[PDB]
RNA sequence: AGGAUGUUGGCUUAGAAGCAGCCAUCAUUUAAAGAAAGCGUAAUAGCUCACUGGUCGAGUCGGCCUGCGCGGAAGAUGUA
């Protein structure tokens, strides 16, 4: 599970998730999984989708993970009233905007990359699409 | 399937063989296993006869180049052509005993002389001796 | 060889450019050389098919505007964030 | 009969049919492949 | 109608031949010594394939063929067993000449129009069994 | 209608013959026919696919962008 090794602060504001994404094109590999929806990606979802793609291509070629869950999310335990300070950090998320490229793959045929990305997309809470590297 | 460049090349080659040969025998060969074909191929190579199954459309194109344009009508149904390029006949001969013996397929029309040859009367070619008989 | 038909834009801005993309077109610009830059409109899907070929970004294209051919090269392309669409193209005079 | 929300062709012989507004999968080969959306 | 690969001047055994065509209606001893009778001329220890041909009255005829390519290639490489992992583990060498010999035998049994073609097929086998042609 | 030859490819195994598994996947005759896509056998056999010739005779194929619909959709007094 991806997680920052250390942070300047432990807890962060909720914030908002407006706007479109940066890094909207395949920059390392040849095929990419681009998010068309908006939402959060927990570190477990990222790891689950990575394993689904890693096993799909039988550990072949190269795989990049363009996102990183750097935002901590706190929760209050059960049977606890409101107040008495912010909750404890439970997991980390990466904010996703439409157009964000999540994963990139290289070294495999396209027809195999589509199935690998299709298996991984089933683990993610946001709608995605298949993209390929283009001549800028 | 077969790109247009393919089929053009298939025609060209069948046509070039048609120029060199001297006796063409055409037959149906549907409903015969590949072993009996493989056997007929060793009998063709042995007897110096060139054997091809080719699309009836595609043969009509080869033929027209000369002098087999009588054979057009022989290209309705499954077609097997027999080009005796070295010596004449022997194919006409070979096909009939092979035809009779195997009671599958038929044999259509042959062609020598730039004249179509009728199914029954092919017995002419199928009895012409050796070259190599005039001595 | 790619030839493109274009029309000169009547007005610029965010409001005008979004109306173009709603009308199955998209703006572009032609600069380079000593001439003044020229703002043009392009038919989207027709240009979208041409840019799908790798030589579109390497060879020299001709844009006929007011019946006048201009030889240019594709400089930069602004694509839609998540749709197979174009938003803007920079053309530099060859 | 498999009653699920996502019906799909499981082999070459599976056919998609819509009967009375219900998407169904009928297979002339594998009776296990018989599905209906529900 | 059954096909076997039997050792030259050897026949009869139960796990080898017996049961196999024995459970089809075939007279064992007859085929045994007829087979051996005609396969006497074969070199010692050449495994030869025979196609046995039985008719409704349990009587039979058979054809003898040339030994398998794998066999001749085993003998030509002087080995006993093909590679367990052909083309990952190499287990020997036949010259182009040995290929050609085997090809002419198997030519009596091939479908190649030329020496070269037959040889190429034999090479195909030789590759298939991790023997290099050297 | 054909779907062949080396050949039951090599290894393994009691057997492993396209079809438990491992490795290889060449070559021939080909119109075409994978050292086999699925069923089948103790292993063969046997069925079928890929592929190709024939018949038919003008369209047929599968991706994208979008509009509107379908399923997914089970609660308690009574349609609600």
Curated annotation (Swiss-Prot), chain A:
Single GO term (MF): structural constituent of ribosome
GO biological process, one term: cytoplasmic translation
Modified residues (N-methylmethionine): 1
Record key words, sorted: Hydroxylation, Methylation, Ribonucleoprotein, Ribosomal protein, RNA-binding, rRNA-binding, tRNA-binding
Top-level division of the source organism's lineage: Bacteria
Family, per entry: Belongs to the universal ribosomal protein uL16 family.
HAMAP family: Ribosomal_uL16 (MF_01342)
NCBIfam families recorded: rplP_bact (TIGR01164)
Assembly with partners or alone: Part of the 50S ribosomal subunit. Cross-links to the A and P site tRNAs. Interacts with assembly factor DarP(YjgA).
Annotated protein name in UniProt: Large ribosomal subunit protein uL16
Organism whose genome encodes this protein: Escherichia coli (strain K12)
From Swiss-Prot, chain C:
A single GO BP: response to radiation
Record carries keyword Disulfide bond: no
Keyword rRNA-binding: yes
InterPro entries: Rbsml_bL25/Gln-tRNA_synth_N, Ribosomal_bL25/Gln-tRNA_synth, Ribosomal_bL25_short, Ribosomal_L25_dom, Ribosomal_uL5_bac-type
Keywords, ordered alphabetically: Ribonucleoprotein, Ribosomal protein, RNA-binding, rRNA-binding
CDD domains: Ribosomal_L25_TL5_CTC (cd00495)
Role noted for this protein: This is one of the proteins that binds to the 5S RNA in the ribosome where it forms part of the central protuberance. Binds to the 5S rRNA independently of L5 and L18. Not required for binding of the 5S rRNA/L5/L18 subcomplex to 23S rRNA.
Family: Belongs to the bacterial ribosomal protein bL25 family.
Protein's UniProt name: Large ribosomal subunit protein bL25
Protein source organism: Escherichia coli (strain K12)
From Swiss-Prot, chain D:
Pfam family, one: Ribosomal_L36
Swiss-Prot/TrEMBL keywords: Ribonucleoprotein, Ribosomal protein, RNA-binding, rRNA-binding
UniProt xrefs under SUPFAM superfamilies: Ribosomal protein L36
Coiled-coil parts of chain: none
GO BP terms in the entry: cytoplasmic translation; translation
GO function terms (MF aspect): rRNA binding; structural constituent of ribosome
An example Gene Ontology CC term for this record: cytoplasm
Record-linked InterPro entries: Ribosomal_bL36, Ribosomal_bL36_sp
Subunit structure of this chain's protein: Part of the 50S ribosomal subunit.
Function: One of the last ribosomal proteins to be assembled in the 50S subunit, it contacts a number of helices in the 23S rRNA, acting as molecular glue. The simultaneous presence of uL16 and bL36 probably triggers ObgE's GTPase activity and eventual dissociation from the mature 50S ribosomal subunit.
Family stated for the protein in its record: Belongs to the bacterial ribosomal protein bL36 family.
Name the record gives this protein: Large ribosomal subunit protein bL36A
The organism of origin for this protein: Escherichia coli (strain K12)
Gene from which the chain derives: rpmJ
From Swiss-Prot, chain E:
UniProt xrefs under InterPro entries: Ribosomal_uL11, Ribosomal_uL11_bac-typ, Ribosomal_uL11_C, Ribosomal_uL11_C_sf, Ribosomal_uL11_CS, Ribosomal_uL11_N, Ribosomal_uL11_N_sf
Organism encoding this protein: Escherichia coli (strain K12)
Keyword line: Methylation, Ribonucleoprotein, Ribosomal protein, RNA-binding, rRNA-binding
Single GO MF descriptor: structural constituent of ribosome
Alphabetical list of HAMAP family matching this protein: Ribosomal_uL11
N6-succinyllysine modified-residue sites: 65, 74
PANTHER family for the chain: 60S RIBOSOMAL PROTEIN L12, LARGE RIBOSOMAL SUBUNIT PROTEIN UL11M
Protein family (similarity comment): Belongs to the universal ribosomal protein uL11 family.
PTM-bearing positions, type N6,N6,N6-trimethyllysine: 33
Name of the molecule in the record: Large ribosomal subunit protein uL11
Physiological role: Forms part of the ribosomal stalk which helps the ribosome interact with GTP-bound translation factors.
GO annotation (BP), single: cytoplasmic translation
One Pfam family of this chain: Ribosomal_L11
